[PDB]
Amino acid sequence: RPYQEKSLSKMFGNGRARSGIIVLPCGAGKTLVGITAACTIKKSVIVLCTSSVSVMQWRQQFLXXXXXXXXXXXXXXXXXXXXXXXXXXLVVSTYSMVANXXXXXXXXXXXXXXXXXXXWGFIILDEVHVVPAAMFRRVVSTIAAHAKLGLTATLVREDDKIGDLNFLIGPKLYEANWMELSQKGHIANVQCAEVWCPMTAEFYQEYLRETARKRMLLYIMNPTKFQACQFLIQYHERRGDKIIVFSDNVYALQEYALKMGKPFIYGSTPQQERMNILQNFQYNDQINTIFLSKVGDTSIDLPEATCLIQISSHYGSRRQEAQRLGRILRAKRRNDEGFNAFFYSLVSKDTQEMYYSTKRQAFLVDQGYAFKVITHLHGMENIPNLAYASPRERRELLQEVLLKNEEA
DNA sequence: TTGTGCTATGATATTTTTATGTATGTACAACACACATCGGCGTTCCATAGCTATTATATACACAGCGTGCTA
**Integer angstrom CA distances of residue A154 from A159, A213, A294, A319, A335:** 14, 27, 17, 9, 23
Burial class (CB in 10 A: 0-12, 13-18, 19+), A337: exposed
**AA letter at A399:** Q
Residues constituting chain A = 408
User: If DSSP codes are grouped into helix, strand and coil, which group holds residue A174?
Assistant: strand
Measure, in angstroms, how far nucleotide B32 C1' is from residue A106 CA.
Answer: 39
Segment (H or E) for A22: strand A18-23
User: If DSSP codes are grouped into helix, strand and coil, which group holds residue A168?
Assistant: helix
Sign of the Cα torsion A10, A12, A18, A19 reads positive
Strand nucleotide closest to residue A296 (CA to C1') = B16
Residue pair A289/A243 in contact by the 8 Å Cβ criterion: yes
Experimental method: cryo-EM
Segment (H or E) for A46: strand A44-49
**DSSP annotation string for A49-74:** ESSHHHHHHHHHHHHHHS-SSSTTB-
Residue pair A59/A68 in contact by the 8 Å Cβ criterion: yes
Measure, in angstroms, how far nucleotide B44 C1' is from residue A317 CA.
Answer: 107
Strand nucleotide closest to residue A249 (CA to C1') = B15
Which residues in chain A are immediately followed by a break of C to N over 2.5 Å?
none
In this structure, the dihedral spanned by the alpha carbons of residues A326, A331, A336 and A339, taken in order and rounded to 10 degrees, is: -40
Strand B bases contacted by the protein (CB, 7 Å): 14-21
Residue pair A331/A303 in contact by the 8 Å Cβ criterion: yes
A319 — phi, psi (to 5°)?
A: -65, -35
CA A25 to chain CA mean position, Å: 12
**Integer angstrom CA distances of residue A404 from A144, A226, A317:** 53, 17, 24
Helix axes A354-366, A318-331, angle to 10 degrees: 50
Measure, in angstroms, how far nucleotide B20 C1' is from residue A98 CA.
Answer: 16
Task: Print burial letters for A193-205: b (CB count within 10 Å at least 16), e (below 16).
Answer: ebbbbebbebbbe
A129 — phi, psi (to 5°)?
A: -65, -20
| Strand pairing category for A189-197 and A370-374 | parallel
User: If DSSP codes are grouped into helix, strand and coil, which group holds residue A172?
Assistant: strand
**AA letter at A373:** V
A261 — phi, psi (to 5°)?
A: 70, 40
- Please enumerate in sequence order all residues whose Cβ is within 8 A of that of A308, keeping only pairs 6 or more positions apart, or say none: A244, A246, A325, A328, A341, A342, A343, A344
Residue pair A376/A229 in contact by the 8 Å Cβ criterion: no
